[PDB]
Curated annotation (Swiss-Prot):
Biotechnology comment: This protein is a target of protein engineering. Its selectivity-directing and activity-enhancing mutations have been extensively studied and the designed mutations allow this enzyme to act on non-native substrates and/or in order to enhance production of synthetically desirable end-products.
Summary of the function given for this chain in its UniProt record: Functions as a fatty acid monooxygenase. Catalyzes hydroxylation of fatty acids at omega-1, omega-2 and omega-3 positions. Shows activity toward medium and long-chain fatty acids, with optimum chain lengths of 12, 14 and 16 carbons (lauric, myristic, and palmitic acids). Able to metabolize some of these primary metabolites to secondary and tertiary products. Marginal activity towards short chain lengths of 8-10 carbons. Hydroxylates highly branched fatty acids, which play an essential role in membrane fluidity regulation.
Organism: Priestia megaterium (strain ATCC 14581 / DSM 32 / CCUG 1817 / JCM 2506 / NBRC 15308 / NCIMB 9376 / NCTC 10342 / NRRL B-14308 / VKM B-512 / Ford 19)
Protein name from the UniProt record: Bifunctional cytochrome P450/NADPH--P450 reductase
Effect in UniProt of substituting residue 262 to N: High substrate-free turnover rate constant. Negligible substrate-induced spin-state and substrate-induced heme reduction-potential shifts on addition of saturating concentrations of arachidonate
Effect of mutating residue 258 to Q: No effective fatty acid oxidation. No effect on electron transport from NADPH to FMN. Nearly wild-type level of high-spin conversion with laurate/dodecanoate, palmitoleate and arachidonate
Residues given in the record as heme binding sites: 394
Taxonomy, superkingdom: Bacteria
Substitution effect: residue 255 to E: Ineffective covalent modification of the heme macrocycle. Substantially slower FMN to heme electron transfer for the arachidonate-bound enzyme. Product distribution biased towards omega-3
Gene expressing this chain: cyp102A1
Binding of (9Z)-hexadecenoate, residues: 49
Family (UniProt): In the N-terminal section; belongs to the cytochrome P450 family.
């Protein structure tokens, strides 16, 4: 079969289609127009975007396809190096770090993180309890305060102290501005008009490198048994080697960013869908009240929040917050009986489109129905992939879910929520997705919160 392709712009081919602040949303629209697969060409490159469970299931066969670094991940790699997210599977440091850090995401590990998660969650609740009448909440902003603080404390024993700030933490400001500068630069000339951009860039890289330095120095100065403990001391059972110093620095930056941005988006979209679906809200709120019987939640009680977990999975169905991942053909192969591929050919999996495959989910794919997740074996293999695929799947999945379940459960226990502005969904795309400008009012249920 000859592959569909979107509209062209002469020698630039399809490239100008991505000249938008919302490329993933643009690609979704193209997918709706063209179907389960389409080719996308730019000068010097080609990729094929996949949207159906039938094709994506084959792309997820690790004997045939491996993780690729898309253009986006190559760019991030200048900052995240050969950390876990931006390493190739065949680089020695991938499997070494995987094996060293996997234990940091065990059950015993999650039990160990729980107390510090509650520390940050209690700060969020107290914030909202302390608002005056008729004041509102800036949802993605507060969720990011929470999730940045949580990875800093749980992972690193570092306090970002984001609830003591009206502005973003300087580390995040410097990361975003360093990423932007790196991007604007390619598209420009050593005009001394750009000497100031270069000065700002050095200062932002310094902010990042100083934080990394400080995380490491504070630990050496200090018994912890957290993510940073395993980075600094753990040995790979296979090679017998620990991580090298440079790789440790890349892991710290990778985890600080990866370990919060997508989770903030998930909590934000979950609350959005709950306020837009009051009967679902009522069910989740009822579960929180019935389960969360103590002044602060226990690990076991978070595990008991089945419906809250279904809400979170449904939010990930509709708006998976790391919405695309890339693969390459390990050898020449034919995809779906129809599309020949050569060794090295790139594929992109459009997760939001996969999650709207009517042949899997039924016709009502735009509806928010947590109940889809009530009998989990009923979800076909490779139908639901918000955490990626195979050995290159999200290492932090359990950490994200535990944090989000805890936090959303506490939110629902302690407050009633109002969509006071009748908010119109506007999804901002960065490395992640978020509902930009989402605001609510939260009226306290006046339920005491433990220490
Ligand atoms: C709802 C939250 C999250 C979502 C939707 C998400 C999604 C993803 C996806 C789709 C990948 C695969 C990327 C690819 O194939 O290119 C991935 C990888 C990764 N994630 Fe997550 N993630 C979440 C939370 C986290 C958290 C909390 C952590 C850290 C504590 C984290 C750390 C990582 C790392 C290090 C990898 C690379 C794994 C490897 O290749 O060895 N993620 N995540």
């Amino acid at each position: 079969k000859e592959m569909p392709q979107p509209k062209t712009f002469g020698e630039l081919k399809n490239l100008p289609l991505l000249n938008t602040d919302k490329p993933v949303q643009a690609l979704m629209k193209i997918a709706d127009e063209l179907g389960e697969i389409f080719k996308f060409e730019a000068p010097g490159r080609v990729t094929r975007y996949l949207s159906s469970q039938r094709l994506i299931k084959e792309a997820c066969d690790e004997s045939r396809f491996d993780k690729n670094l898309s253009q986006a991940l190559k760019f991030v790699r200048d900052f995240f190096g050969d950390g876990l997210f931006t390493s190739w599977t065949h680089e020695k440091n991938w499997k070494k770090a995987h094996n060293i850090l996997l234990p940091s995401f065990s059950q015993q590990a999650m039990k160990g993180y729980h107390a510090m998660m509650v520390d940050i969650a209690v700060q969020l609740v107290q914030k909202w309890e302390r608002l005056n009448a008729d004041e509102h909440i800036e949802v993605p902003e507060d969720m990011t305060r929470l999730t940045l603080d949580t990875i800093g404390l749980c992972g690193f024993n570092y306090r970002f102290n984001s609830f003591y700030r009206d502005q973003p933490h300087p580390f995040i400001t410097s990361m975003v501005r360093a990423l932007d500068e790196a991007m604007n630069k390619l598209q420009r000339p050593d005009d001394p008009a750009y000497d100031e951009n270069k000065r700002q860039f050095q200062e932002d890289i310094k902010v990042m490198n100083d934080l990394v330095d400080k995380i490491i120095a504070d630990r050496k100065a200090s018994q912890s048994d957290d993510l940073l403990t395993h980075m600094l001391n753990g040995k790979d059972p296979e090679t017998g080697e620990p991580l090298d110093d440079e790789n440790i620095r890349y892991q710290i930056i990778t985890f600080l960013i990866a370990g919060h941005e997508t989770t903030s988006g998930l909590l934000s979209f979950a609350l959005y869908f709950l306020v837009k679906n009051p009967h679902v809200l009522q069910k989740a709120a009822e579960e929180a009240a019935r389960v969360l019987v103590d002044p602060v939640p226990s690990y076991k009680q978070v595990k008991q929040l089945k419906y809250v977990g279904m809400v979170l999975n449904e939010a990930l169905r509709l708006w998976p917050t790391a919405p695309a991942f890339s693969l390459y053909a390990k050898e020449d192969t034919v995809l779906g009986g129809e599309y020949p591929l050569e060794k090295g050919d790139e594929l992109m999996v459009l997760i939001p489109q996969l999650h709207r495959d009517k042949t899997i989910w039924g016709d009502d794919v735009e509806e928010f129905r947590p109940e889809r997740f009530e009998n989990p074996s009923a979800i076909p293999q490779h139908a639901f992939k918000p955490f990626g695929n195979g050995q290159r799947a999200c290492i932090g999945q359990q950490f994200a879910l535990h944090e989000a379940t805890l936090v959303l459960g506490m939110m629902l226990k302690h407050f009633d929520f109002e969509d006071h502005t009748n908010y119109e969904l506007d999804i901002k795309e960065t490395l992640t997705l978020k509902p930009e400008g989402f605001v609510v009012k939260a009226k306290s249920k006046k339920i005491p919160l433990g220490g």
